[PDB]
Amino acid sequence: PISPIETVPVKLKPGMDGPKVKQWPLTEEKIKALVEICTEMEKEGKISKIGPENPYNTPVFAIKKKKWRKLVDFRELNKRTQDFWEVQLGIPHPAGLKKKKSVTVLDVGDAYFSVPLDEDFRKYTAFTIPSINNPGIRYQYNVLPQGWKGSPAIFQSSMTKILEPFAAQNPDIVIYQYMDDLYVGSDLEIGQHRTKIEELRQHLLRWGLTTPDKKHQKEPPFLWMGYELHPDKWTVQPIVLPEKDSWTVNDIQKLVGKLNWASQIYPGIKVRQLSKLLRGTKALTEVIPLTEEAELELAENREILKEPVHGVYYDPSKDLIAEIQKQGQGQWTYQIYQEPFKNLKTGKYARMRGAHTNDVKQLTEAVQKITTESIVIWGKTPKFKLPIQKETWETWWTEYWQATWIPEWEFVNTPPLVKLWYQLEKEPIVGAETFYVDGAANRETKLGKAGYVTNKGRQKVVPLTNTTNQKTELQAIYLALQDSGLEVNIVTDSQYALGIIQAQPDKSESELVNQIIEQLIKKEKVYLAWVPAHKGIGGNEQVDKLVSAG
Amino acid sequence: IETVPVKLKPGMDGPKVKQWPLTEEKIKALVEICTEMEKEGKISKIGPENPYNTPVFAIKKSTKWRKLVDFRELNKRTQDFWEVQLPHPAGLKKKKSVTVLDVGDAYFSVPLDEDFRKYTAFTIPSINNETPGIRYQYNVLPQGWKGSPAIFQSSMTKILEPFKKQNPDIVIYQYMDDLYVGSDLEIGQHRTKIEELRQHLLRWGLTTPYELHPDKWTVQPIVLPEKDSWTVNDIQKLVGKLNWASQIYPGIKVRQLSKLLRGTKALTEVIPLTEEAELELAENREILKEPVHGVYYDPSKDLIAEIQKQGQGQWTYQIYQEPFKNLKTGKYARMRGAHTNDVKQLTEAVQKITTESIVIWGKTPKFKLPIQKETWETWWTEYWQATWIPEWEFVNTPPLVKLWYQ
Ligand SMILES: CN(C)C(=O)CCOc1ccccc1Oc1cccn2cc(C#N)cc12
Ligand SMILES: [Mg+2]
Numbered sequence: 001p002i003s004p005i006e007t008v009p010v011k012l013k014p015g016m017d018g019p020k021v022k023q024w025p026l027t028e029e030k031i032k033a034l035v036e037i038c039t040e041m042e043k044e045g046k047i048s049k050i051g052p053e054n055p056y057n058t059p060v061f062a063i064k065k066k067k068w069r070k071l072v073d074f075r076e077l078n079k080r081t082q083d084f085w086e087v088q089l090g091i092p093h094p095a096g097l098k099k100k101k102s103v104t105v106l107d108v109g110d111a112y113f114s115v116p117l118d119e120d121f122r123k124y125t126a127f128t129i130p131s132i133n134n135p136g137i138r139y140q141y142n143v144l145p146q147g148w149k150g151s152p153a154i155f156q157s158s159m160t161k162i163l164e165p166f167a168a169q170n171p172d173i174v175i176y177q178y179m180d181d182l183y184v185g186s187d188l189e190i191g192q193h194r195t196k197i198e199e200l201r202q203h204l205l206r207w208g209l210t211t212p213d214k215k216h217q218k219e220p221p222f223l224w225m226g227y228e229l230h231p232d233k234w235t236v237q238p239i240v241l242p243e244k245d246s247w248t249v250n251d252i253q254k255l256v257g258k259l260n261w262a263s264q265i266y267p268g269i270k271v272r273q274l275s276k277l278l279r280g281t282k283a284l285t286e287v288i289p290l291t292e293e294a295e296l297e298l299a300e301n302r303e304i305l306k307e308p309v310h311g312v313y314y315d316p317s318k319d320l321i322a323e324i325q326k327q328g329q330g331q332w333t334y335q336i337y338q339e340p341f342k343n344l345k346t347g348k349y350a351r352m353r354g355a356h357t358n359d360v361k362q363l364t365e366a367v368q369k370i371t372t373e374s375i376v377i378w379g380k381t382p383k384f385k386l387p388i389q390k391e392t393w394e395t396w397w398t399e400y401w402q403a404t405w406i407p408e409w410e411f412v413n414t415p416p417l418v419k420l421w422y423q424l425e426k427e428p429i430v431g432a433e434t435f436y437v438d439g440a441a442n443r444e445t446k447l448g449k450a451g452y453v454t455n456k457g458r459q460k461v462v463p464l465t466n467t468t469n470q471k472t473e474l475q476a477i478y479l480a481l482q483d484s485g486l487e488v489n490i491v492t493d494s495q496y497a498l499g500i501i502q503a504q505p506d507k508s509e510s511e512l513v514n515q516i517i518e519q520l521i522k523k524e525k526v527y528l529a530w531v532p533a534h535k536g537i538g539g540n541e542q543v544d545k546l547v548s549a550g
Numbered sequence: 551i552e553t554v555p556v557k558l559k560p561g562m563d564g565p566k567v568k569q570w571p572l573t574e575e576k577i578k579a580l581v582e583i584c585t586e587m588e589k590e591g592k593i594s595k596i597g598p599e600n601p602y603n604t605p606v607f608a609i610k611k612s613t614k615w616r617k618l619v620d621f622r623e624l625n626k627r628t629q630d631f632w633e634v635q636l637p638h639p640a641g642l643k644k645k646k647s648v649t650v651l652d653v654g655d656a657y658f659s660v661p662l663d664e665d666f667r668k669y670t671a672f673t674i675p676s677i678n679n680e681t682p683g684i685r686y687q688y689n690v691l692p693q694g695w696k697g698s699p700a701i702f703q704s705s706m707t708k709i710l711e712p713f714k715k716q717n718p719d720i721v722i723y724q725y726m727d728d729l730y731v732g733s734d735l736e737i738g739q740h741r742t743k744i745e746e747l748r749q750h751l752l753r754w755g756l757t758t759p760y761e762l763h764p765d766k767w768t769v770q771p772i773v774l775p776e777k778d779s780w781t782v783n784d785i786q787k788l789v790g791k792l793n794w795a796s797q798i799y800p801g802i803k804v805r806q807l808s809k810l811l812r813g814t815k816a817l818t819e820v821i822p823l824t825e826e827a828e829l830e831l832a833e834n835r836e837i838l839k840e841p842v843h844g845v846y847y848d849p850s851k852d853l854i855a856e857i858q859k860q861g862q863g864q865w866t867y868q869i870y871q872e873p874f875k876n877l878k879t880g881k882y883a884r885m886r887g888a889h890t891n892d893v894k895q896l897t898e899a900v901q902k903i904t905t906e907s908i909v910i911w912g913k914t915p916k917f918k919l920p921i922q923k924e925t926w927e928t929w930w931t932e933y934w935q936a937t938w939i940p941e942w943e944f945v946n947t948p949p950l951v952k953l954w955y956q
Contacts (some may be wrong), residue, residue, distance in 0.1 A: 086601070161680075378574075429818070
């Protein structure tokens with residue numbers, strides 16, 4: 001049917017006129033399908049024959065991808081019409097849905113054709129069925145055309161307004177609206193829940209919106225946007241990881257996609273070594289040979305995907321809880337649940353956001369991602385059970401120069417525990433050898449040397465090939481660590497190298513800094529001090545004259 | 551009762567900013583607030599043919615919720631036409647006492663130009679995308695749109711002209727929803743003249759719900775440590791800090807001080823300050839008392855604020871337009887109170903600096919904040935009392951700016 005709803009007024013973009021894309025010539029069998037469809041559609045009021053003075057046109061075609069369907073090419077009109085309040089992009093998340101005793105799924109059939117289109121805008125929808133000779137027939141739309149820029153929003157808003165009466169008289173019946181679907185839930189007796197469905201079905205039929213007849217139709221488990229929804233549990237649809245010898249950029253992309261998708265209910269999914277591959281990427285065609293780390297990751301994912309997992313729905317009376325577990329190379333995993341083994345959902349956090357990081361910083365960032373996620377899904381923030389002790393975190397967030405909001409959390413003792421593997425000293429160390437380090441490299445020949453000069457009288461210079469002033473500045477520190485007792489003072493002129501160490505990293509993209517980290521753990525006390533370069537302080541002046549000079 | 555035509559800057563479309571997800575608590579408060587605002591006709595529900603959007607937050611400013619609208623983008627896209635549309639007194643920074651009054655409720659009497667109303671559209675988000683938002687637009691002059699004080703100016707001058715004739719030595723500056731009222735009176739007299747004006751405004755239909763003292767502000771000078779026994783490390787720090795300062799005050803000298811370190815020496819070795827090095831350090835303390843030289847304010851250029859966490863509730867800040875040319879510096883302190891946190895203190899500092907900046911120059915600075923972006927966007931509304939919002943971005947504090955500014 002059609003509708004007595006009010007129409008949304010619609011303008012074209014200021015200074016633009018209607019589309020005039022001529023009709024591609026059509027085979028006479030398709031012109032037969034269009035003429036019959038158009039006369040049926042005309043008979044239902046959805047379209048109208050129009051005079052000759054309408055200047056605008058839009059191409060039309062017929063197909064039946066092995067009944068017939070009419071398809072229209074509004075690409076040109078879409079460019080010329082104004083923008084609309086963007087349709088719902090996000091979708092509800094299964095973990096966010098509140099449990100209900102029964103759920104109906106209604107498909108509004110032919111929904112867009114069931115809604116009127118603004119009158120003054122109708123001239124710009126004109127289309128032509130081709131005559132055999134040239135004189136063709138001219139039709140225009142009176143309902144929302146399928147494929148025009150404004151149909152999804154205007155039908156969405158028309159549907160919201162149509163529901164408003166029925167919803168007010170039924171503060172018991174939950175109606176999610178999503179595209180041209182209605183998902184109806186209630187805690188009524190299945191006898192009367194079917195009554196209220198029947199009411200709603202007709203209320204929409206008065207507004208012109210048809211609904212499934214054969215019972216309420218669509219039956220569980222529900223295949224919905226890559227999910228499986230059961231009456232008591234949800235899970236993702238089954239993932240298939242390809243088995244391949246070579247991989248293109250496009251194949252790895254489709255593979256982190258599926259993997260990312262599975263990580264919301266399959267705890268333990270890892271994707272970082274696989275997306276390290278796409279770091280360069282370039283062309284989706286480029287073949288990217290996999291890595292021993294990428295292979296191990298993909299292997300471990302197939303292992304986890306071998307068993308089936310499910311999540312539960314939301315009860316707003318039960319608490320909201322998250323735990324986070326370490327997974328290794330800066331990869332982390334979390335569950336969010338209300339009942340201790342019934343998980344609402346899971347997820348992963350493996351971002352470095354920089355070349356070097358450390359465990360506490362990464363955990364804090366994981367707690368961030370969970371918080372933003374809980375607000376989007378349940379409108380609240382969870383209680384946190386975390387594998388870290390207050391002393392560990394309190395020390396970290398106090399010495400940390402960046403401001404941070406640590407939630408309330410209880411320690412859960414479940415190793416691997418999050419810890420600071422080392423702390424530099426805040427005061428210089430007494431009776432410890434003072435190493436004055438420096439490095440240099442030639443910005444053209446890229447050759448270099450790192451060296452030190454201590455106060456016990458030791459001096460050393462190690463030669464370096466294919467490096468930069470920044471890399472030698474770290475090798476210099478690395479050299480002083482290698483060559484010192486368990487306690488050492490190091491004095492550097494590098495603001496770069498000071499910055500990287502003082503950050504107290506414990507993992508890194510570069511293997512030099514990974515080497516320096518291993519040194520720093522083995523030491524007992526280390527103090528790192530900075531002096532301005534080329535100011536002849538003493539100590540520094542002699543390493544500059546030794547290494548930087550040559 | 552008659553509207554004032556409002557234009558966007560030519561060839562410029564309205565805002566399409568994204569609504570931030572809110573907690574169920576904050577949404578329920580926005581819906582209550584917006585239902586009442588709809589009854590009083592200040593806002594109306596809009597259709598899908600309005601594509602514009604401005605974010606909304608719920609803050610507390612009290613135990614009742616307020617609604618704060620982020621017109622930052624709509625202000626870029628129009629208010630500069632209202633910054634030039636048809637003024638800042640430099641004496642307000644000189645007044646001994648300054649009080650801030652919230653007069654933003656006067657705005658809800660003036661109709662808004664019906665052809666501009668689409669640009670004020672905003673959305674109350676739903677949880678988990680169950681619904682699309684509830685969508686409204688403004689009928690009246692909305693708070694936080696810089697065109698609101700611009701249009702109301704004529705009425706507001708009219709209301710204040712009595713009071714200004716009586717008290718001719720009091721400074722009244724308006725910035726957005728606030729009046730800044732400054733006097734040199736005794737504090738008790740000051741609070742009286744504030745009440746006189748408060749009552750004056752309430753008498754003419756201007757519902758009004760902060761005391762500052764710019765005579766105490768300054769540009770904090772650099773302080774060098776004063777020790778009893780110096781180590782090699784203390785002099786290295788002292789020499790490093792004075793080396794930084796010499797990009798700013800030029801007559802600083804370090805020869806005699808670094809002479810004390812000649813040769814390779816252990817860091818813990820105690821060095822005595824020779825008489826020459828003491829004179830150089832004493833002379834260097836004296837040059838740090840005088841201010842910088844060519845640091846002037848350019849009204850056309852942007853003000854930038856940098857902030858450093860210093861430990862134990864201390865936060866330093868600098869306002870400059872060109873690096874090293876510091877217009878103001880200062881340090882903030884929170885009394886902690888075992889209810890404080892890093893984000894409460896950062897949020898409080900941003901507001902102090904912004905108020906201080908508004909008094910001095912009449913515009914908000916663009917902040918470089920030392921915090922992860924995603925952490926700010928979640929928690930900033932929990933201690934935001936101000937009715938305005940400055941521009942901001944996120945940075946990683948360098949390793950030595952902490953101590954040199956300490
Ligand atoms: C089976 N299931 C989801 C429950 O039991 C939880 C209760 O969820 C609902 C509550 C009210 C209205 C509908 C509900 O279902 C849906 C909510 C959101 C999206 N949807 C897509 C489909 C399909 N196809 C069904 C739903
Ligand atoms: Mg050097």
